[PDB]
């Protein structure tokens, strides 16, 4: 069964390209990644930098999560991302997708022992 | 504007792991942490205890402070820290610095409310 971690790997990491890759992109990852499988996930966030990177977010400014919950840590340094986000024209099973490149804060919930990113909250 | 609190986490927390895994540890975390943005900060300490057992300072040993202020607080344990000093030959901006590990007690300034670290005065 898929642990909370690695789920977090499946929907928020792309360390393989620096930025947005292309106008394609979200269409492609949304797929791969399995995220248009039961519905088109309306929003999604990758992050293109080291997992090792990411996970340090967990050691961070921590600062509350949209829920209201505690456990939300925010990064010092701006981090390459591409946010994802359904068109209008966009009607399951073909999901289709605006991709946008931006330098921002990420904000992550992390949980466990390891305390590793189970959510990814927003960006800044 | 980022608080003195704020400040002494971002420049001094990293409840990550119990030590440093690699000698790049600090050329990363002195990255990660904004210190090497505008010139390389050539020294600086991270504690590797939890942020609760590093708050507990401030109910622990008084002493006084470097600038002779009496706000000052020694760990009665020792902790998990690593030192990181600039090398001789880093030059600005590929700041380059040798990671050290040490088990030592820690004093730090204390202040507001909640009573809490706001400066790292020395490892011993």
Same mark, same amino acid.
């Given at each position: ?6 789920? $977090? ?10 930025? !947005? %890759? ?21 929003? *999604?966030? $990758?992050?293109?930098? %080291?997992?090792?990177?990411?996970? !340090? ?13 505690? *456990?939300?840590?925010?990064? &010092? ?14 009607? &399951?099973? *073909?999901?289709? &997708? ?10 992550? !919930?992390?949980?466990? *022992? ?5 959510? $990814?909250? !927003?960006?800044?």
């Amino acid at each position: 069964k898929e642990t909370a971690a690695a789920k $977090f790997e499946r929907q928020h990491m792309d360390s393989s390209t620096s930025a !947005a %890759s292309s106008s394609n992109y979200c269409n492609q990852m949304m797929k791969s990644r399995n995220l248009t499988k039961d519905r088109c996930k309306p929003v *999604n966030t $990758f992050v293109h930098e %080291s997992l090792a990177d990411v996970q !340090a977010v967990c050691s961070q400014k921590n600062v509350a999560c949209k829920n209201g919950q505690t *456990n939300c840590y925010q990064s &010092y340094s701006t981090m390459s991302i591409t946010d994802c986000r359904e068109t209008g024209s966009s009607k &399951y099973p *073909n999901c289709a &997708y605006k991709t946008t490149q931006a330098n921002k804060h990420i904000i992550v !919930a992390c949980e466990g *022992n390891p305390y590793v990113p189970v959510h $990814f909250d !927003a960006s800044v």
